[PDB]
Amino acid sequence: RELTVGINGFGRIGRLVLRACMEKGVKVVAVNDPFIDPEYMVYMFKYDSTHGRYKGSVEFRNGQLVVDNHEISVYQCKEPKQIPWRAVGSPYVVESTGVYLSIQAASDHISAGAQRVVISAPSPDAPMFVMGVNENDYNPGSMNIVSNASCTTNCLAPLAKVIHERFGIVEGLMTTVHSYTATQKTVDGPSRKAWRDGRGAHQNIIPASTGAAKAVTKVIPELKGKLTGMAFRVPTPDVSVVDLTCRLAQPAPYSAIKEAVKAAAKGPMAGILAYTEDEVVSTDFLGDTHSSIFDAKAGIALNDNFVKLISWYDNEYGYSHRVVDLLRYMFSRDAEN
Amino acid sequence: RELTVGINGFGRIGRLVLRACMEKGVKVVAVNDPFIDPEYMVYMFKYDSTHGRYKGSVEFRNGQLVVDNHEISVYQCKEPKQIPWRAVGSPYVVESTGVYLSIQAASDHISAGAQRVVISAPSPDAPMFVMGVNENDYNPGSMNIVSNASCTTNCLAPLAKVIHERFGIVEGLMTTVHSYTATQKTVDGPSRKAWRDGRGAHQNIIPASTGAAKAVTKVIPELKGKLTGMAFRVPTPDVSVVDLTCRLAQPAPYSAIKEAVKAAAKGPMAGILAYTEDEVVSTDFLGDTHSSIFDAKAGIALNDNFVKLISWYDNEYGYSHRVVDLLRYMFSRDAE
Amino acid sequence: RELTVGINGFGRIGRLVLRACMEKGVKVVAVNDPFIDPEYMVYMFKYDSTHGRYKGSVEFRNGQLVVDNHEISVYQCKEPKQIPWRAVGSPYVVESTGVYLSIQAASDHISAGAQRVVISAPSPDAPMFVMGVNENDYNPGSMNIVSNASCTTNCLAPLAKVIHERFGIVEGLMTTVHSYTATQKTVDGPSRKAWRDGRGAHQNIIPASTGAAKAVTKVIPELKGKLTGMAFRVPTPDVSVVDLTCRLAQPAPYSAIKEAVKAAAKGPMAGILAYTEDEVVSTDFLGDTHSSIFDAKAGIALNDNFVKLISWYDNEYGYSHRVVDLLRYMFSRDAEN
Amino acid sequence: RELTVGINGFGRIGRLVLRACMEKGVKVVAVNDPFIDPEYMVYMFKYDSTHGRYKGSVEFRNGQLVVDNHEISVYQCKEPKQIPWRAVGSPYVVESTGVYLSIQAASDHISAGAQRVVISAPSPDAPMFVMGVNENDYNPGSMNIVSNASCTTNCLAPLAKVIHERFGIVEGLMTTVHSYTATQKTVDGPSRKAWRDGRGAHQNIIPASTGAAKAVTKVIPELKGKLTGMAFRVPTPDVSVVDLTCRLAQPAPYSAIKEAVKAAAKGPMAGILAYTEDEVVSTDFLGDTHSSIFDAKAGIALNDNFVKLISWYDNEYGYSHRVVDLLRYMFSRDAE
């Protein structure tokens, strides 16, 4: 009768989800990754190029990963249907492999003994949630497979909600200037499904499609047809920034925009949306747990109804924190039985 | 009876202007830079981290830089009033130091012997020009000091002109995702006039100003109050991209946008504005001489009146070619 | 009765081998890569983040890649035994996939119709060659599967040959400061066989084992037991540098070392070993076709018998040129029938 | 009756020295930097691209920088002779500007009121110290201006001492693969005193000098003529690694090398020299306070008398901690 968590895919998100669970006191009972044995998991969790050394103890024994004296079972399965989730008492599962994105693909975790699945990416069909925006729409009795959307959606949606509710978004287009990720290549190589994404990640500014802005209209249905966008991948290893250009229905002097964002940050979006007026740059958000940090000085108003709003996000770390927040939220709701 | 060019500030722009002049047959008679001696100028011109080795001969002798057998006088002065422009026959001067941006600061070149000055950046008061957009407003009678605007302005203005003339820009905002430059720092250091610009250039996405925010509506006055924008400096050493989000007056389905850009690129803006449908990334424009290369596949439309348009530019190389094109244009008009 | 070439694995080396063949007038009859279709091959060959746009025409039609009007057959096979080399008249095959490194693995090309194979990497057992060092040891009648060693070996061996023959190498240890490659990761990810190599390539200086110095003693047997070394992978996308610290038998004033290197560069190692006294840095060798460029000003002599010698190499481009040179050499020798 | 510290040059080293002082309870009474005002110092100290946000409070008021409630006077002088060190009670001064390296240049601090000066770089003439190697040679009677050598010297000297004392270094040569620094350039620009250092720092592997080449045999005189080396600057923003290739007198099988380093790290060089057998890379040492971290698995031996030894260092952070350790050592010795 406590939340327990299983992680499938011990990657950037998977490992940082474990870090967040340790920080928040969420019990992780098992990790599955066929490419990382237990001894190697210790190394990959202990040392991080982006987020530093884990501040605590990491060891292995008895085929287990032991973090701050918490024993975590380690499985080595290539397919969700192979994973023995029943053995660790039917945990809530984070699907962070990147390759099981549909209800059908993720449902094999349920039949292998998972109580619920949270897909750590947009899904073509599983219901999507962004904490601070639409988590109340989760239904414990009808949804065992959900999605926590993307990092970009988690940055954009809270800001879009604040702005739309105060001023009215008539239409908006967004760009994210985004750090490279594990799907990209060190040098020019094959990416048949998205050719630009094969090009050397460290050498290039790379345009890339993203459903993340429209995704904000799955989580904020009033914005259907009113928001879309795209990405540029650039040579930084973490932290990204949303640039939202929108036309507003009611006049929105920039002072009124700042006040609305601050009010949201201090109140209902505390911990999700933050507000700064400092002269920040991307590294200043390494390790930041917010979904969206509004950059007051970087935005521009052409006029009272046409503005460019800028918001930062640690795409690895903020998102991993939201995965945990969504799990905890789901569990508190699922207690409705 | 012929165009001759002097360069003040033998930097990224100054050296690439000399390369462009060599490519386009324009005679450079002198280069001034107090921080680079002739023998050192050979090395800095011969080897380039971004644009490769100079394909030709580079030597020094008799206090001169010699490129492909052309002798270039080398001066070593810290202030424009010190430079002996009269000794090399009153050249047209490129002001590419970054620190003499006003008519007042640049006029010292004229009184030191320069025939004309082209400031290689936006100016608070000198008239600004973008080839393909407003060069015809140059008035030989009354403009001895001019500006070639900025690299971003040279990318944005040709595209904005095409879109505005075809569909009508009601309002627009732009971003440039821009390579780092010489004003930035390798590691966090002082930049009291722009604090974010001091932060390590290779480590950060850095919000910043763009010269295009102010310059674009000087060169296209009809857009005054309808367009501005900002930059993010990112960890690439050259090539940048404009992302222009605009609301349009006339219906602008994306097929019509593509046909409008193509027409401009094949016609009046040939050599200035190009058009691609290839799956391009920033390195694909290293050494491209165009001002603006419209990326058809990267753009997105929300609807027929609200669109995001993407256009690339080699911020060092395209702009340097435009400096040379402006000089040749001025010289031809000065014969009136 | 002309050299014809088949490429297996159209990667950094595979594509740059095709560029070199075009430059040198070597006929490439076919390319095989299961991850790159013909239309996508056009794109990957045309545009290069490191070496610029291909200067010529690239098109596809009739299931073929057409470069400067030369038609090249394109195959899409995952295993060497699947490739129809007989269909294109028994070419000499470049094995540049990175995954068929042994005589046994590469021999399937022979049974599929390849006349010879050149493995574009060190082999555990195929005989290895470095142009300018030991190519004369190739035997047309006994070797159908050979190796062109590695980029580092191709840089080190020519210099080591010059120095050993003039002064005598008593012992030497080398480091290569080397650009990242396709085997590395954009962000921290799994590399179970070599853990450091999983760490983000763009963020880190990464120590990495290399058999490349000892490899110089397979190609220069007199140096057995006398040379080994290691690598640091660093955040550049191409071009690397050898730093060889050696104790010499005969006194070797640095002026005598420079003269020996120059004599080799102007004479028997022309096109293989070059010599500069300019104030060069890594980008200055992008596109350089030499195996080894000796940096006169960067080296140090502690004394007449103990020195550190520095030599540059474009690891992608120089090596790709040597693959072609070795093919042409093999073919001229194989004419012995 | 207590150590007080003044910092001249509030740069990478100056700010990280203030961080180290805050961590180690050392009182900083003043900071001087003509290029950073108090309000700007708050920002530059609070936010760090490499080492993260300062974990504490940072404010300005009354012309002062206030860190965790400690008031620090802020001066704005361009020359040491201008700095009012007497106003803050004759502090021990860190000279971390990079431009006052000689006894003669640094002595102006003494005549302006400094009790002592620690130059944060090798000096042509001031006596140089490496903690764990030769600090005992400091003579309070006769050394008011000293140097803490360089970061590479602080990595190399402790390891060289251990190896030489155990096995005897016959001869050695070293390389440091070193992160870029503030002296380097974002894009190819002028560096007339060291041409390769002008080339774009983020694009290139750059051969360069290391302060350790000359400094190591000043701090370990027994190695004079037996050790020198060079650097390659590469595209990382912090952390560097020494690669020491030496011929040894006594048999040195690699197991014995490991036991010798371990013994030093656990004993007399605790906090200075560390020892790891983990599969480490450069980022793993961000924020490490040790001078030298021996990488057991990365090294290689050709034979029992010829070996290559690898040791890491956070060039910014480890060195800044050593500056503070040297100041505290000097202060304790000055009580004699």
Ligand SMILES: NC(=O)c1ccc[n+]([C@@H]2O[C@H](COP(=O)([O-])OP(=O)(O)OC[C@H]3O[C@@H](n4cnc5c(N)ncnc54)[C@H](O)[C@@H]3O)[C@@H](O)[C@H]2O)c1
């Ligand atoms: N990195 C980001 O910024 C980010 C942010 C939000 C969401 N996401 C999403 O999170 C998911 C993972 O992203 P990542 O960045 O962590 O990628 P990653 O490549 O770092 O991690 C994927 C992990 O999954 C493991 N794996 C692969 N196949 C597996 C399988 N069949 N079974 C079990 N494990 C398998 C890999 O070995 C690896 O450790 C993706 O859907 C991604 O879109 C990423």
Ligand SMILES: NC(=O)c1ccc[n+]([C@@H]2O[C@H](COP(=O)([O-])OP(=O)(O)OC[C@H]3O[C@@H](n4cnc5c(N)ncnc54)[C@H](O)[C@@H]3O)[C@@H](O)[C@H]2O)c1
């Ligand atoms: N780099 C770009 O992308 C780009 C593009 C368009 C325009 N610009 C503008 O061009 C100008 C030069 O920029 P850059 O990127 O070439 O900078 P840079 O730092 O590379 O070049 C400036 C050069 O001026 C020399 N210099 C400095 N002070 C001088 C003086 N007082 N007198 C003579 N020479 C002096 C320097 O030694 C250096 O060689 C700036 O105004 C910049 O805004 C830059």
Ligand SMILES: NC(=O)c1ccc[n+]([C@@H]2O[C@H](COP(=O)([O-])OP(=O)(O)OC[C@H]3O[C@@H](n4cnc5c(N)ncnc54)[C@H](O)[C@@H]3O)[C@@H](O)[C@H]2O)c1
């Ligand atoms: N890049 C260098 O600096 C360098 C230099 C010298 C030698 N090498 C060696 O050359 C070889 C290739 O290196 P690379 O850098 O070009 O790697 P790469 O990853 O860029 O290229 C490998 C190519 O092989 C293809 N491939 C993968 N599996 C295949 C298969 N089963 N059949 C056919 N094709 C397949 C991939 O799709 C890819 O295009 C490796 O052995 C490498 O060690 C690399």
Ligand SMILES: NC(=O)c1ccc[n+]([C@@H]2O[C@H](COP(=O)([O-])OP(=O)(O)OC[C@H]3O[C@@H](n4cnc5c(N)ncnc54)[C@H](O)[C@@H]3O)[C@@H](O)[C@H]2O)c1
């Ligand atoms: N960065 C490293 O890894 C490192 C390590 C060890 C030692 N050092 C040495 O430390 C010194 C500082 O290096 P850094 O990397 O901190 O450089 P830096 O450029 O970051 O810092 C120098 C600071 O001095 C200030 N300054 C410049 N001129 C001044 C003057 N005349 N008076 C007062 N302040 C002035 C600058 O505004 C800047 O804040 C150099 O001697 C360097 O060799 C650097």
